[PDB]
């Protein structure tokens, strides 16, 4: 391992993350320290690059030295053997070791993630939503604070779309109602028409089902808000306009299927 | 003798100075220079009639009245002076409680002295004067326990008198291992209240300190410190009023239970007396 | 000293013109020292009553005014170190930085068409933000009082209601002595029983073209936002 | 062993001089250049101590002139692989007296091909060293 830990055989690099199969035994992994080290040290061969990433992975962290390692990696990552793709797979892979999970971490790492950014955060989060969802993380209110915040100034319709959709889906289940409110009007806040109209579907399975508050005001709220703008008019009127031809109850049930 | 040797770069240097002001202190180098400023940042007291006691944050004594430009006080009750971990006043207009060696240690010495005379340490057949050994000395709430560390660690002092020096290991209670508070605040940012035992609170209250709560003269002052901010309350919590500022420096003062005097540039004020407002 | 000379600013219409007492209640017209013009940012001070006698037990006013338009110094927020001297019936004298000098008056509400504004919204110097969350009010009165205290703009409401919550972003612009835009959205909650509003943890992103001005502006105004123990 | 995707001698223009697909099983002149260019281009002339694309070894060198190409998997050590690729330059250079060069190889092709079919044929390398070769050829 040793002789190798210098690109003796940069084949060393791949055997890690699986060919070489690491998710040890207690006080085996106290050992592993040295050698990801050296690794995490250098920083460069391409065989290294990805070499930091899977060791690291493998053997696991201290929370600690990840902190070392952000500013390490906020130079690092953008170019330094093109270290952006196997960050990317190695991102992918802390998506799913926390997928929303260690939510601080997730939360730390999202500040993290954005802030060191470039832009190339936007391909990883494809991939770190898709984790959040996999767990159908519990510390959204926090995670998904995090996330709408940031996403607002950090930009990106495409985003937008697809967590729109999710979202669309998800509503009161989670509660939390104000804040969600409070969210989705920013979102819609946004021009586009398109960037707007979102909020809107997204509450279909929401407004449905209600919350810790909704459905007296869920029936005030579509009337309190209103536009025009003509085919911006028309989705509102439409909206209205093919709630006004369903009972509202029974409008929810066929649309929302 | 060479006591340590210290290295922040400069292979190269030709001068090292300290202040014939004594204000700063700063070494030379080739390579480029650097200046550092020293601070007890806030440090202890005692009063006696009249008189104010100060233990330098920097500066010596100041220490009460005043002549011409500055002057620090220099008298038998040296204040900003010593190797301070505390001091506090042991009232009588005539006796102080000090802890000198300061810092860490196992335990220090405390050398209480007289106000009628000071020494290097007074007399342990005189009771203004007595000295033992003893690492930190220190105020808690519902006033007359009090915490005296003679171990490296948790001893409760506890006595009705404050001409005080008492050794009291139950109360042992760490969780919290020999560092800084004085209503009990290893930053626990709260004053707890305890007897001289106890492994069962009497209760904390939410508010916050300088690391010291200020009592009117001698130990019953509802008027707070707060490190940055200080609150006024009567005695006890009750938040009165609550004060801020943003000079992270100076001080405000009180003439016992929340007077409130305040500085004022080159005026210096009265904040507020009965439903007044006042430049005295 | 008998002579004491207490003063404060006093700005009064554009001039920022500085109240001095000198009081010398001095034993004579005791001499005085040195002082000295400058440029200053857009402003420049200006005047000095020529005098340097500390007239006996006898106090004077002394008048500077400062020039409001001109003069660039750049040492924002001012804070610029400034002389009296100790040269006459003085060994010393006070130098003296200005702290005191802000923002949330500065600025004069200004106005926009929303789409475009919209489109300018997320066009324009993106970089600030600061967070809405905490008072004493609802941001009705609240509101109010912000607004008045920057004297500063929101442009438009949309009837959604700020009363039964609303669930309201308010979008406020503002142009300033010294011409700079500055525009905010902030998005929050807003008082009401057991609904929501007596914090906000609504965002004001602020945008201002540097950021470092801007940022301190959201600052500013967080300061402004409350009311407590300055 | 029937492993060669290609081997290409590219410039590094993304140019390609020289390709064999050895094996291939996708196509297009286009798409090969396509494929080309997301990973020339991306290493533009750079190369790697080892690169795989695709799960896929690349290896790849660079010479001093030229832009040399394998593509292989990873799925078979960077050893060997690299020996042949080690072969195809030293040999190249010695024999000729004169390893690549852009100019080397405007003047003629040839020899390249020569060697290059010795060397391997399709996706298995019947050889990885020169001697055996030199002495073999006598062109």
């Not at chain 2, 290097?120 to 050994?133: F, H, L, T, V, W």
């Not at chain 2, 915490?147 to 506890?158: E, G, Q």
């Not at chain 3, 004579?28 to 020292?33: E, V």
């Not at chain 3, 489109?119 to 008072?135: D, H, L, S, Y």
């Amino acid at each position: 391992q040793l002789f190798c830990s210098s690109p003796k055989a940069a084949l060393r690099y791949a055997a890690v993350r699986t060919l070489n199969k690491v998710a040890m035994k207690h006080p085996s992994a106290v050992t592993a320290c040295n050698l990801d080290l050296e690794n995490l040290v250098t920083d460069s061969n391409r065989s290294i690059a990805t070499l930091a990433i899977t060791t690291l992975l493998k053997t696991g962290s201290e929370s600690s030295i990840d902190r070392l390692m952000k500013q390490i990696s906020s130079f690092m990552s953008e170019i330094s053997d093109e270290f952006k793709v196997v960050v990317v797979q190695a991102i992918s892979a802390l998506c799913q070791k926390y997928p929303r999970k260690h939510a601080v971490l997730m939360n730390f790492l999202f500040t993290m993630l954005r802030e060191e950014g470039g832009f190339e955060y936007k391909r990883a989060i494809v991939d770190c939503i898709i984790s959040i969802i996999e767990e159908n993380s519990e510390s959204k209110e926090t995670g998904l604070s995090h996330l709408c915040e940031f996403i607002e100034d950090c930009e990106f319709t495409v985003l937008a779309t697809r967590i729109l959709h999710l979202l669309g889906q998800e509503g009161p289940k989670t509660n939390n109602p104000s804040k969600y409110i409070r969210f989705i009007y920013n979102r819609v806040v946004l021009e586009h028409e398109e960037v707007r109209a979102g909020a809107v579907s997204a509450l279909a399975k929401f407004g449905a089902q209600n919350e810790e508050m909704l459905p007296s005001i869920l029936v005030l709220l579509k009337r309190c808000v209103m536009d025009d703008d003509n085919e911006v008019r028309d989705r509102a009127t439409f909206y209205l306009n093919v709630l006004e031809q369903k009972q509202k109850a029974l409008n929810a049930g066929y649309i929302l299927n | 003798t060479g006591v340590q040797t210290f290295r922040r770069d400069h292979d190269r240097f030709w001068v090292l100075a300290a202040h014939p002001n004594l204000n700063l202190f700063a070494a030379g180098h080739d390579g480029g220079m650097i200046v550092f400023k020293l601070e007890r940042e806030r440090p202890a007291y005692a009063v006696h009639g009249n008189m104010l006691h100060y233990v330098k944050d920097r500066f010596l004594r100041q220490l009460d009245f005043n002549s011409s430009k500055d002057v620090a006080v220099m008298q038998l009750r040296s204040g900003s002076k010593f190797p301070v971990f505390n001091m506090s006043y042991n009232p009588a207009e005539n006796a102080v409680l000090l802890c000198t060696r300061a810092s860490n240690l196992e335990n220090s010495t405390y050398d209480l002295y007289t106000i009628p005379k000071d020494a290097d340490s007074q007399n342990p057949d005189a009771p203004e004067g007595k000295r033992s050994s003893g690492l930190t000395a220190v105020w808690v709430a519902r006033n007359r326990f009090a915490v005296l560390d003679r171990m490296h660690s948790l001893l409760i002092k506890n006595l009705k008198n404050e001409i005080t020096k008492k050794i009291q290991v139950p109360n042992c209670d760490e969780i919290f291992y020999a560092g800084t508070g004085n209503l009990l605040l290893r930053d626990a940012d709260s004053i707890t209240l305890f007897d001289v035992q106890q492994k069962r609170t009497l209760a904390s209250v939410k508010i916050s300190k300088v690391k010291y709560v200020i009592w009117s003269a001698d130990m019953s002052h509802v008027a707070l410190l707060a490190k940055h901010a200080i609150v006024i309350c009567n005695r006890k919590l009750d938040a009165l009023c609550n004060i801020h500022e943003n000079i992270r420096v100076k001080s405000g003062a009180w003439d016992e239970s929340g007077v409130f005097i305040y500085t004022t540039s080159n005026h210096i004020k009265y904040a507020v007396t009965t439903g007044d407002h006042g430049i005295i | 000293d008998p002579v004491y000379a207490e003063a404060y600013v006093h700005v009064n219409q554009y001039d920022i013109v500085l109240d001095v007492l000198v009081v010398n209640q001095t034993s004579d017209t005791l001499q005085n020292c040195t002082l000295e013009l400058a440029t200053l940012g857009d402003l420049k001070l200006v005047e000095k009553p020529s005098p340097l006698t500390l007239a006996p037990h006898d106090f004077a006013n002394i008048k500077a005014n400062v020039k409001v338009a001109s003069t660039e110094n750049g040492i924002i927020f001012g804070n610029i170190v400034y002389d009296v001297s100790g040269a006459a019936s003085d060994r010393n004298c006070v130098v003296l930085s200005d702290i005191h000098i802000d923002i949330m008056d500065y600025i004069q509400p200004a106005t926009c068409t929303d789409a475009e504004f919209r489109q300018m919204w997320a066009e324009f110097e993106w970089e600030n933000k600061v967070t809405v969350n905490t008072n004493m009010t609802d941001l009705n009165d609240y509101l109010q009082h912000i607004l008045k205290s920057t004297n500063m703009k929101c442009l438009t409401p949309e009837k959604a209601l700020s009363g039964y919550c609303g669930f309201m972003a308010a979008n406020l612009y503002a142009r300033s002595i010294f011409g700079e835009d500055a525009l905010a959205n902030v998005s929050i909650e807003k008082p009401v029983h057991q609904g929501p509003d007596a914090a906000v943890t609504g965002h004001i992103r602020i945008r201002a073209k540097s950021q470092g001005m801007a940022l301190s502006l959201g600052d500013k105004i967080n300061l402004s936002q409350k009311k407590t123990s300055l | 062993l029937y492993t060669v995707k290609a081997i290409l001698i590219l410039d590094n223009d993304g140019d390609r001089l020289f390709a064999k697909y050895y094996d291939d099983t996708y196509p297009s002149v286009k798409e090969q250049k396509a494929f080309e260019k997301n990973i020339f281009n991306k290493t533009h002339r750079t190369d790697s101590e080892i690169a795989l694309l695709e799960g896929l070894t690349v290896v790849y060198k660079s010479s001093i002139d030229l832009y040399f190409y394998v593509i292989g998997s990873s799925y078979e050590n960077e050893l060997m692989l690299m020996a042949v690729l080690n072969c195809l330059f030293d040999s190249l250079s010695q024999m000729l007296r004169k390893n690549v060069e852009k100019r080397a190889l405007l003047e003629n092709m040839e020899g390249l091909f020569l060697a290059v079919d010795e060397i391997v044929d399709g996706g298995v390398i019947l050889e990885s060293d020169p001697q055996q070769v030199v002495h073999r050829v006598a062109l």
